[PDB]
Amino acid sequence: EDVVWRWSCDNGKCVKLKNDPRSSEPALSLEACKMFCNEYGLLWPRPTGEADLGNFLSKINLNSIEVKILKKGATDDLMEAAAKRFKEQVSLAIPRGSTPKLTGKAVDVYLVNENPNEKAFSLEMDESYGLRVSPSGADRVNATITANSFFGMRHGLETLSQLFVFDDIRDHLLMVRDVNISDKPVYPYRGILLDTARNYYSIESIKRTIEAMAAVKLNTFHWHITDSQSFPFVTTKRPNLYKFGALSPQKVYTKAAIREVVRFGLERGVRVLPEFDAPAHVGEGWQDTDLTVCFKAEPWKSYCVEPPCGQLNPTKDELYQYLEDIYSDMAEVFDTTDIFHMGGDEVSEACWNSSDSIQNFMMQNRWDLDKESFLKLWNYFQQKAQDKAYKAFGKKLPLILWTSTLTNYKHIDDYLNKDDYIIQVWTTGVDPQIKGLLEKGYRLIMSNYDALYFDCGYGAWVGAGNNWCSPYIGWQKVYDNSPAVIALEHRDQVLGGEAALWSEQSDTSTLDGRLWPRAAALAERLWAEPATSWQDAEYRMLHIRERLVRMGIQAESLQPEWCYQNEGYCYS
Amino acid sequence: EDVVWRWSCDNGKCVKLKNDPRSSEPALSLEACKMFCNEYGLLWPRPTGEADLGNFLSKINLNSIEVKILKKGATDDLMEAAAKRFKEQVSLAIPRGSTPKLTGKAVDVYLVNENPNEKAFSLEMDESYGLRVSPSGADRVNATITANSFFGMRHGLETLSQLFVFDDIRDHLLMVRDVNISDKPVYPYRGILLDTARNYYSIESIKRTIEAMAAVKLNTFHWHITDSQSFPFVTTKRPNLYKFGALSPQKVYTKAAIREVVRFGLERGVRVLPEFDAPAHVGEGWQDTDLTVCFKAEPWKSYCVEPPCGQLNPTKDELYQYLEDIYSDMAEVFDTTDIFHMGGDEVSEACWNSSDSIQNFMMQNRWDLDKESFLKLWNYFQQKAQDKAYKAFGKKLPLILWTSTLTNYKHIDDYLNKDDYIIQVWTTGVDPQIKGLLEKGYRLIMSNYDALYFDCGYGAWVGAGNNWCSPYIGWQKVYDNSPAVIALEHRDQVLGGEAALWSEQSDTSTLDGRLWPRAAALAERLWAEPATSWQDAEYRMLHIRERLVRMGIQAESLQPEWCYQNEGYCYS
Ligand SMILES: CC(=O)N[C@H]1/C(=N/OC(=O)Nc2ccccc2)O[C@H](CO)[C@@H](O)[C@@H]1O
Ligand SMILES: CC(=O)N[C@H]1/C(=N/OC(=O)Nc2ccccc2)O[C@H](CO)[C@@H](O)[C@@H]1O
C-alpha cells in the first residue's frame, strides 16, 4: 500500500504519470513537483518582495529542528511561544497517519528581532521580514528570519513552515534548500468579523479561527459580541445585561475567557478588536432598564431591518453611565486593541419616532419629527458615546462606524471627522459612497457585501427562498475583489479589508466551513494585492485548503481532489 | 449562573417571560413548554397514526432505565445492541456540561418484536410500531414498544428517546407521562446518496452519517463509491482498479471497513446500497486495461458533462469479466442490500463515436453512426452487465438506473422493463418524463435536482460564478417537495426519495453541514407525507437541528437561537 504514481512538471502543471520501475529518473511526489512547478510553490500568501525558492529540496530530520532567539527583549515570552509552536507547524506538512523517517539534515532556525521590546498593535506597525535558507556545513541547514518586530518575525516563521514538504513516495520530510524571501503586507488591516450575538461560538472555535487566521497572516479579529438577539459579554459593572441577555448561562464570554482569546491572538499576531454596536442592534439584556425602545416591536418590518427590533434611547442620561461601564469593562479585557468599533449600522427613524419621551425631547430642543432631525439625535448620541469610549480606553483612539445614513459623504463632516473615525464599508464595491468618502479624506475598511459577506447564499432564515445577499460568494470572487481597484488613487486611505461572518445562520458547528478557505483568498488579496487574477492562484489555493484540513479545520471543499492531483484538466 | 427565564404557551408559541420569584405558578423550561405547546411536541418525524402526548411530564432517574426484550429470535444481537444504545440516546436530551439530578422514577422499557427472526431489508418490510407510555405503580414508568419486526422496533426506540426533556431550570430529566403513538412510514425507500469518488469520506464520517440518518428514521444509504475521478472500492479480484484508482493508498474502502459500515447500518435500520456507475463515469483505475475510451479526453466539454471524461468500451468481452468480478466483490461485502444501483447517467455518444474499435463493431453489426444506434450499444452493454449483476448477487434483484436518454419513457420499454428496473429521477419535479414513466408502470426514487440536490449553491468548481444547480436549496424547499404531488394517482409506484450529496465540492470536512438538518426535512416528508407545509414544521425543525448538534453532528445553522427561544417573532 504505497503510492503508485509520480508527477512531472509540464508547462506549469504537475502531470500524473505511472511510477514505472524501469527508469533512471528519480520519481517526484505531488507536493515536491508543485513546490517548483508553481511560480510561488506552496506558499500562501505569496511574498511581495523576493520570492526565490531555488531548484532543490533537502531531506531533514523532524527531531533535529532547533530554534534560536538571537535578540532578547520584552517580547521574549511571545518569541519563545512562537518558536515552540514551530515544530507543530512543520508537522503540518506530514499527512495524518504517515510518519517520516528520522534521517537527514538538522535545521537551525535563527530568529533576529530588530526591535525586541515592540509588541503593540497599531496601523503603523512593521509586519515586514526577510527569510533566508541555505545549507550550513555538510550536515545542517541555516534558516534565518530577520524582522523589525515580533509580528514580522512571526509571519516569517509562518512562511518558513510552508517550505517543508512530505514525500509520501519515500516517507521523507523535505525542505527547500535555497531560499531568498523578502516580504511585507500591502494593507495593515486584514480582518475577519465574527458575529457571536446572533448565535454563540465556543471559545475553542474562536481560538481555532485565530490559528487559521495566523496561518495565512490575517491580523485582525473583529468580535461583534453584542446585538439585539443576545448579550454574551460578561460586564462585571452591569451584570444584568449578560444575565438577562445571554442565550444561556453557559453561552457567555467571561473575563478569563476573553483574556485567553486576546492573549492567544497576541501570540499569533492577531489583534482582537471588540465591537459594541450602538444605538441600533440592542435588545436582549436591556430589559427593566427603560433605556431601549422598540424591543420586539411588531410588526418588525415597520421598525427594523431584522427581528428583534430594539434601539437605545439617547435621551436618557443613565444610558451613558451604562455605556461608560460597558466600554470600560471591554477596555479591561480587550487590552491589545488600538481601535474600537462602535457600530452605527441601520438606525431606524420610525423606531425613535414611536417613543413619546424621545418626541418630547426633540420638541423641547426645537427639532422637528422629520427624517433630518433624527440625524441630530444620532449625532447627540454618538458624541456622548464617543466621550465615554475615550474615557474607557484612557486615550483618544481611532473609532470605527459602519456605512449608514450618518456616514453619507455629503453630510458626514457635519457629524464626524476623518481623523477620529474610520469607516467600514459594506456597500457594493461600485457604490458612489466609496469615492465620495475617499475624496473627503476618510479611511476605509473594505467589507463590500457583494464580495466579502461570507453569510450570503444559504436558505432564508425568515420566510422561504434564500438569504438577502445571495448568491453564495465563491473564493474566486473574494480573490478578485481589489481595494486598489475600488479606491484607485486614494488607496492609501484604505486600511485594508474584512470578511464578514454574520451569524443568523452560523455558529460553532459551521464556523470552519464559512470562513475557510475563502478568507485565505482575502488574505492574499490584502497581503499581496496581486495584479494577477484567481486563475493564477488556483493551484496554491487548492493546496492551502488541504493545509487547513491538516490543521483540524473543517474547511470547505473547492474541487475534486482529482483536480488537485491533475492540474490543468479541470477548467472552464 | 442559573437560567433567568421561563416560557409559557400562548397560541401555539412558547413566549419567554421573566421567572419572577413572587409567583405560585411552576416555571416551565423552554423544552418542557415546547413539548406541549407544539402540536407534535419535540418529535421528528411526527407520527402518522396516533400522536397522543397527554399533558404532563414525570421526573425520571437516568441511572434507572432498564430495557427488557420480551421475545427472543434471530435478531437477538440487533435488539440487544439497539437496547444498549438507548441510554446513550436518552442522554441526548441533556446538554453537554449539564448533569441531571439522580432522582425520580425508574423506567421499564419493554420491547415486543412480533417476528424476532426477521432481519432482511426489502421494499415490503414492515417498519410500523406502537408506542405506549404510562405510569407503573407509584415509583416507575411502563414504556412498551410493539412492532412486527426489528426495524419497526428500532424506530420505536428512536421516537421514545425523543420523549425525554431536560429541565435546565431545575436540572431534572423529564419524560412524557402519558403517551399513545402508532406510526409507520408512507414510503419504504428513504435515502441519502453519498458520492465518495469525487472526494474521499472517512469511514468515521460515513458511520456518523448513519447515526444521524437513524435519528430521523432514514433507512437507505446509497453509496456512490466509484466514478471517473477515483476508485476507492477495494476489489480483491481486480486489485489494480483501486491500486491505480484511489486518490491515495489510505483513501480506500477495504472489505473490513465496508463490512463495518454495513453492520453499523443494519443495527440502525439502514440499508447500505452500493452503486457501480456504468458505462459512463469511469476513468481512474482502468489504466492499462484498454477497457475504457476518452479517459481525460480534451477538450472535455466535447466528450463529457464534467472532467475527467471516460467511458467503458462495451465491445470488449474482457470488460464483462471485470464487471462480474467487481459486482461479485461488492455483493460479498454489501450483503444486506436487496437492490443494486447500476448508474447509467449521462452516456456520451461523441465519446463512443471517437473510438475506431467501437465504430468497427457497429459497422459489422449493421448499425449506423447516428445518435439512435448508440442506444443499441448501450442496451447491449446494460443487458450483459445486468447478467453479471444477477450472477454476482446469486439472484434476480431489483436494479436502479438514473433518468437518462436510455430511460426516456417514449422508448424505455425497448430496452428495460418495469419489473427489473427502478428509475431514480433527478429531473425537475415538473419534468414530463415523470408522468410518462409512471404511466408505463415504472417505479421511481425521487431525487429531483430542484429540491433534492444538496450540493447546489456553492462556488463554481470549474471556472467562476456558482455551481450548475444553484441556488442553494433551503430545508423549506426540500420539506415542501412532495412525491405525492409529483406522482398524483400513481404515487404507490413512488418507492420514496433520496437527497443527493454529490462530492465535487464535499468531503469528510463538510459532510455534516451538507446533509444536516436538510435531510431531516426529507425524512419527515417521506415518513409522514404531511398535507401541511414547512411553516407548520418550522419549530420542530429548529429543535431537531439542536438534537443533531448534541449528537456531535456539525449541522447547518438555520436561524438565530433567539428565534428558537422566541417563537413567532421571526417570520416573513
Ligand atoms: C452592517 C450590516 O451588515 N448590518 C446588518 C446587515 N444589514 O444588511 C441588510 O440590510 N440586509 C437586508 C437587505 C434587504 C432586506 C433585508 C435585509 O446584514 C447582516 C447580515 O448579512 C446583519 O447581520 C447585520 O446586522
Ligand atoms: C445523475 C447525476 O446527477 N449525474 C451527474 C450530474 N449531472 O448534472 C449535470 O449534468 N449538471 C450540469 C448541467 C449543465 C451544465 C453542467 C453540468 O450532476 C452531479 C452534480 O450535481 C454529478 O456529480 C453527477 O455525476
Atom of ligand 1 nearest to the CA of A403: 1
| Cell numbers that stand for A470 in this block | 445571495
DSSP alpha helix (H) spans, B394-531: 432-439, 449-452, 475-480, 483-487, 511-515, 518-528
Is A227 designated active site? yes
Beta bridge partners of A52: A180
3-state secondary structure of B484: helix
* Spatial CA neighbour of B343 closest among B292, B300, B297, B385: B385
Contacts of B24 (CB under 8 A, 6+ apart): none
How far apart CA A71 and CA A66 sit, in angstroms, is 16
> In this structure, are strands A140-147 and A105-113 parallel, antiparallel, or unpaired?
parallel
A402-439 as b/e: b if 16+ CB within 10 A: bbbebbebeebeebbeeeebbbbbbbebebebbeebbe
Contacts of B132 (CB under 8 A, 6+ apart): B142, B143, B144, B146, B179, B180, B181
* Spatial CA neighbour of A45 closest among A275, A218, A290: A218
- A536 at B interface, C-beta within 8 A: no
Atom of ligand 2 nearest to the CA of B502: 23
Among residues A31, A195, A227, A546, which one is catalytic? A227
| Cell numbers that stand for B463 in this block | 471556472
How far apart CA A553 and CA A551 sit, in angstroms, is 6
Atom of ligand 2 nearest to the CA of B424: 1
Among residues A172, A222, A281, A543, which one is catalytic? A281
Answer yes or no: do A549 and B509 touch at CB < 8 A.
Answer: yes
B-chain residues near A307 (CB < 8 A): 563, 569-571
CA B77, distance to chain mean position in Å, is: 24
Beta bridge partners of A140: A106, A136
How far apart CA B472 and CA B455 sit, in angstroms, is 8
Question: Do residues B176 and B44 make contact, with C-beta atoms less than 8 angstroms apart?
Answer: no
Among residues B222, B281, B341, B543, which one is catalytic? B281
Q: What angle do CA A222, A226, A229 make, to 5 degrees?
A: 130
* Cis-peptide, bond into residue B299, ω within 30° of zero: yes
| Cell numbers that stand for A553 in this block | 479545520
Going edge to edge, which strands form the sheet with A57-69?
A51-52, A179-183, A129-136, A140-147, A105-113, A57-69, A172-176, A164-167
> In this structure, are strands B5-10 and B399-402 parallel, antiparallel, or unpaired?
unpaired
Phi and psi at residue A466, in whole multiples of 5°?
-120, 160
Among residues B31, B127, B195, B227, which one is catalytic? B227
Cα A450 to middle of ligand 1, angstroms: 12
CB atoms within 10 A of CB A177: 18
How far apart CA B389 and CA B383 sit, in angstroms, is 10
How far apart CA A95 and CA A82 sit, in angstroms, is 22
3-state secondary structure of A293: strand
* Spatial CA neighbour of A488 closest among A424, A430, A413: A430
Answer yes or no: do A250 and B97 touch at CB < 8 A.
Answer: yes
* Spatial CA neighbour of B219 closest among B285, B141, B271: B271
Minimal Cα distance from A564: which residue of B? B247
Angstrom distances, CA of residue B531 to CA of A337, A375, B35, B334, B519: 55, 50, 22, 36, 19
Question: Do residues B268 and B211 make contact, with C-beta atoms less than 8 angstroms apart?
Answer: yes
Residue at A213: amino acid letter: M
Residue that is written with C-alpha cell 486563475 in the block: A535
Q: A455 in ligand 1 pocket by Cβ < 6 Å?
A: yes
3-state helix, strand and coil shares in percent for chain B, rounded to the nearest 5 = 35, 20, 45
Residue that is written with C-alpha cell 511571545 in the block: A78
Answer yes or no: do B199 and A561 touch at CB < 8 A.
Answer: yes
For residue A328, the surrounding DSSP H or E stretch is helix A317-333
Angstrom distances, CA of residue B255 to CA of B203, B328, B364: 12, 12, 42
User: Contacts for B331-336 with beta carbons within 8 Å, 24 or more apart?
Assistant: B331/B392, B331/B393, B331/B394, B332/B255, B333/B255, B333/B258, B333/B259, B333/B262, B334/B223, B334/B258, B334/B262, B334/B272, B334/B273, B334/B274, B335/B262, B336/B120, B336/B121, B336/B262, B336/B265, B336/B266, B336/B271, B336/B272
Q: A426 in ligand 1 pocket by Cβ < 6 Å?
A: yes
How far apart CA B45 and CA B183 sit, in angstroms, is 10
Backbone dihedral region for residue A12 (phi beyond 0: left; psi -120 to 50: alpha; all else: beta): left
Greatest Cα pair distance in chain B: 95
How far apart CA B57 and CA B250 sit, in angstroms, is 50
Structural resolution in Å: 2.0
How far apart CA A395 and CA A227 sit, in angstroms, is 26
How far apart CA A418 and CA A408 sit, in angstroms, is 13
Contacts of A185 (CB under 8 A, 6+ apart): A48, A127, A217, A526, A527, A528
Contacts of B552 (CB under 8 A, 6+ apart): B208
Domains and CATH numbers, chain A: 1-184 (3.30.379.10), 185-572 (3.20.20.80)
> In this structure, are strands B164-167 and B172-176 parallel, antiparallel, or unpaired?
antiparallel
3-state helix, strand and coil shares in percent for chain A, rounded to the nearest 5 = 35, 20, 45
Beta bridge partners of B112: B146
Could you tell me where the beta strands, DSSP code E, fall in A378-520? 399-402, 421-425, 444-446, 494-501
DSSP B92: G
Question: Within 13 A of A520's CA, how many CA atoms are on the CB side?
Answer: 28
How far apart CA B332 and CA B317 sit, in angstroms, is 24
Greatest Cα pair distance in chain A: 95
Atom of ligand 2 nearest to the CA of B403: 1
* Spatial CA neighbour of B447 closest among B513, B494, B491: B494
3-state secondary structure of B302: helix
How far apart CA A521 and CA A187 sit, in angstroms, is 14
- A94 at B interface, C-beta within 8 A: no
* Spatial CA neighbour of B452 closest among B490, B482, B485: B482
Which residues, numbered 404 to 463 in chain A, qualify as contacts with chain B under a Cβ-Cβ cut-off of 8 Å? 457-463
Helices (H) and strands (E) in chain B, counts: 18, 20
Beta bridge partners of B146: B112, B130
How far apart CA B419 and CA B428 sit, in angstroms, is 24
DSSP B233: B
CB atoms within 10 A of CB A82: 24
Ligand with an atom nearest the CA of residue B501: 2
Could you tell me where the beta strands, DSSP code E, fall in A333-387? 340-343
- B554 at A interface, C-beta within 8 A: yes
How far apart CA B159 and CA B175 sit, in angstroms, is 12
- Give the end-to-end CA distance of chain B in Å, rounded to a whole number: 35
A-chain residues near B196 (CB < 8 A): none
Q: B454 in ligand 2 pocket by Cβ < 6 Å?
A: no
DSSP A246: S
**DSSP of A127-172:** --EEEEEEEETTTEEEEEEEESSHHHHHHHHHHHHTTEEEETTTTE
**Best mutation site among B306, B345, B404, B423 for ligand 2 pocket (most ligand atoms within 8 Å of CB):** B306
Contacts of A344 (CB under 8 A, 6+ apart): A277, A278, A279, A280, A378, A382, A401, A402, A404, A406, A407
Q: B120 in ligand 2 pocket by Cβ < 6 Å?
A: no
**DSSP of B414-452:** GT--TTTEEEEE-S-TT-HHHHHHHHTT--EEE--HHHH
Angstrom distances, CA of residue B36 to CA of B81, B281, B381: 31, 51, 58
How far apart CA B102 and CA B63 sit, in angstroms, is 7
Q: A158 in ligand 1 pocket by Cβ < 6 Å?
A: no
Which residues, numbered 299 to 318 in chain A, qualify as contacts with chain B under a Cβ-Cβ cut-off of 8 Å? 300-301, 307-308
For residue B203, the surrounding DSSP H or E stretch is helix B203-215
Is A439 designated active site? no
3-state secondary structure of B142: strand
* Closest Cα to atom 3 of ligand 2: B426
- Give the end-to-end CA distance of chain A in Å, rounded to a whole number: 35
- Chain B: nearest CA to A534, how far in angstroms? 9
B-chain residues near A558 (CB < 8 A): 459, 461, 505
* Spatial CA neighbour of A550 closest among A107, A92, A160: A92
* Closest Cα to atom 9 of ligand 2: B305
Is A155 designated active site? no
Which residues, numbered 172 to 211 in chain A, qualify as contacts with chain B under a Cβ-Cβ cut-off of 8 Å? 198-200
Could you tell me where the beta strands, DSSP code E, fall in B233-286? 271-278
Beta bridge partners of A250: none
3-state secondary structure of B480: helix
Residue that is written with C-alpha cell 439542536 in the block: B546
Q: What angle do CA A540, A541, A545 make, to 5 degrees?
A: 115
Experimental method: X-ray
DSSP B47: P
How far apart CA B458 and CA B475 sit, in angstroms, is 16
Minimal Cα distance from A249: which residue of B? B1
Angstrom distances, CA of residue B245 to CA of A117, B232, B242, B297, B321: 55, 7, 5, 17, 18
Atom of ligand 2 nearest to the CA of B198: 23
For chain B, the C-alpha Rg in angstroms (whole number) is 26
